[PDB]
Design a protein around this ligand. Sequence first.
Ligand code: HEM
Ligand SMILES: C[C@]12CC[C@H](O)CC1=C(C#N)C[C@@H]1[C@@H]2CC[C@]2(C)C(c3cccnc3)=CC[C@@H]12
Length: 468
Amino acid sequence: SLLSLPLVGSLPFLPRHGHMHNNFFKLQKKYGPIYSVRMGTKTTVIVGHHQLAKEVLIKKGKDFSGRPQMATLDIASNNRKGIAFADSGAHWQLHRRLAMATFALFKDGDQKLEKIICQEISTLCDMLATHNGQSIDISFPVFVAVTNVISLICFNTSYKNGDPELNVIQNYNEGIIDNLSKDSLVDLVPWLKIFPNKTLEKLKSHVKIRNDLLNKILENYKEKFRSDSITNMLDTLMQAKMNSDQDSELLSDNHILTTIGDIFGAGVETTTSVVKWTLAFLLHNPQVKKKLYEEIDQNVGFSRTPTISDRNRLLLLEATIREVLRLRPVAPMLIPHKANVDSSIGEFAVDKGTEVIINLWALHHNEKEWHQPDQFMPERFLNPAGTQLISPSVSYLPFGAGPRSCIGEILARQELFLIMAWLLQRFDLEVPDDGQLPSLEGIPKVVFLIDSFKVKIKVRQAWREAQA
Ligand code: HEM
Ligand SMILES: C[C@]12CC[C@H](O)CC1=C(C#N)C[C@@H]1[C@@H]2CC[C@]2(C)C(c3cccnc3)=CC[C@@H]12
């Protein structure tokens, strides 16, 4: 009759074993779609069912629109400025509205968002075409294309080919994403505070390069700014600073710096990442990819290059994108939410300041809401006749919802569709000469990245004949 050992701590699973978003998901078979963990004083709630998720994001969105405070996120956002890592309050509301207003501009005009995107995609396809017959990592080329686009939206500026600044930006992007969090942003145990490490040291130095670069651009642009011409995001932010000079403290330089940084960062890493994910799946699914070549041929052909209007006709492509955004969400656990006030979820009590995580991965893989969810099946987003798109499930939130939903969704959907439409029209994208296929397991960082891989690019037999 022995006594049981006193218990000091208890965690449901091993830390740093498997992907957090899948460990939390597997836990639901034991504890249900909502449960909590406690770290000292901090408490975290994980939510794995869509009804509970739509409560947190929508029905009670404003109750749960805060952002928790993390040492790394402070450095990366210059102490909780910007949009994504700014808590709910005066600053976030202002900057999210102005960022949303800038995008609203790019409704068709002399800078119809499509035209910006298409100009930089056309450059890209000319690069890739020089690698005709070779196996390459497509990361940096697509990085350049989207970097020019968001740079145009932010400053009406693009980078000429070969600009060494692009290599500088790529370098500090990888540096921050590396040290922003070991894996997912949700970290059960606070490892950086426990043991000696250089993580915040490294993070600071990449942020110093990033802030110094954006500071050059901004100080430069004060001399280009004319109140009669408000055509990009920096114009928008300065105009606002101009008009208010309680809002002048909200639109300081450091504030404007961070918002632009948030946009410049999100616009490149998310879309570049989703493109790589899509090619990876197509290399694993030639049957899909063949069907995609047929689709484009019988609806766009080679008389001309694809267009946003072509979303009507290239449905299997729209479907494919939907299915990638489901299988491999950019933010499989969104960005951590925080309870701004005493509230409830599923009529369980949630106290002020409590961290709340939506397990978007659990929503996209719940077997009751999805037919064979771990499968790549773009067909699930099409009626059985292949003729129009459908919403097969209610647990599908690739861009979130509510007060914190994605602000660059429109941009993302158009960049994604045009990149994949131009590439399939022009190139056979096949497995390299080594038998290697990309690992579809992914790498959970602040964004769900795919390990780098190589694709063999060949100009299409058809696209060639159409040049005579
Ligand atoms: C396919 C690409 C993308 C996907 C799937 C995506 C999805 C998401 C998701 C799921 C969130 C979570 C919001 C939350 O924390 O609840 C989010 C937030 C956000 N996204 Fe995206 N996004 C994409 C691309 C972009 C782009 C191109 C931009 C360009 C500016 C952008 C800007 C943002 C910002 C600023 C936030 C934070 C908003 C806030 O905290 O209020 N994203 N996005
Ligand atoms: C971390 C990163 C990328 C590296 C860059 O050097 C610095 C950076 C940002 C800045 N400045 C904003 C972040 C973005 C990553 C994507 C983020 C987290 C993002 C997001 C993440 C997932 C989906 N949609 C948007 C909102 C803020 C963006």
